[PDB]
Amino acid sequence: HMRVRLSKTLAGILRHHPGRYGVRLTREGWARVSEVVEGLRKAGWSWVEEWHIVGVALHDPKGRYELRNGEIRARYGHSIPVNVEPLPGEPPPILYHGTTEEALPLIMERGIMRGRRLKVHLTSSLEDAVSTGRRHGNLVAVLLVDVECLRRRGLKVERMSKTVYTVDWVPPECIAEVRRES
Ligand SMILES: Nc1ncnc2c1ncn2[C@@H]1O[C@H](COP(=O)(O)OP(=O)(O)OC[C@H]2O[C@@H](O)[C@H](OP(=O)(O)O)[C@@H]2O)[C@@H](O)[C@H]1O
Ligand SMILES: [Cl-]
Ligand SMILES: [Cl-]
Ligand SMILES: [K+]
Ligand SMILES: [K+]
Ligand SMILES: [K+]
Ligand SMILES: [K+]
């Protein structure tokens, strides 16, 4: 079966619309795998069981998901209120945010903003930043973000996966450089 298709649906459940699949999340974002399974099956994923949902989490190349006995959550990316504790580690001095060239003027005015999500998402992987920008358009720009510039003004830069870090907002003055990718 197509793991990527099931993972995209699962990310939607755990980040955006759990109730549409019969799921209630705890305030830390955790879903009961059994509830996720039943909702997917009712939506036509007629073969899915716990084994497959757990497998999506374990095989995810990015570490999007976290498991503990009976439960699963998304580590980041949510548009519904959750509190996820950070993974250990310090952020590197530069992080990336992929976007579109068309967004640059308003980013240079208002900073990088969270939009519909709880946080602005940054990555230590330039390649991942490019692929994220490409979801929004073909003319991609990657912002290099000065992490100490965020931290010294009191903005926590929290590690959510091996490569993804969240921050409430990126002030325009903390954008060190723009790299073009067409
Ligand atoms: N001041 C502004 N004026 C105009 N535009 C602005 C401004 N600030 C930002 N923007 C743009 O708005 C779009 C928001 O879209 P958005 O919420 O989908 O954010 P975005 O960062 O793309 O997605 C998060 C997922 O991307 C990976 O970090 C990870 O995904 P993975 O789990 O696959 O690793 C994560 O979940 C973005 O274009 C952003 O630049
Ligand atoms: Cl456990
Ligand atoms: Cl978020
Ligand atoms: K649940
Ligand atoms: K995630
Ligand atoms: K973001
Ligand atoms: K954060």
Swiss-Prot record:
Q: What is its EC number?
A: 2.7.1.-
Q: Which residues cross the membrane?
A: none
Question: According to its UniProt entry, what is the function of this protein?
Answer: Removes the 2'-phosphate from RNA via an intermediate in which the phosphate is ADP-ribosylated by NAD followed by a presumed transesterification to release the RNA and generate ADP-ribose 1''-2''-cyclic phosphate (APPR>P). May function as an ADP-ribosylase.
Keywords in alphabetical order: NAD, Transferase
Annotated protein name in UniProt = Probable RNA 2'-phosphotransferase
What are the protein's GO molecular function terms? NAD+ poly-ADP-ribosyltransferase activity; tRNA 2'-phosphotransferase activity
Top-level taxon of origin: Archaea
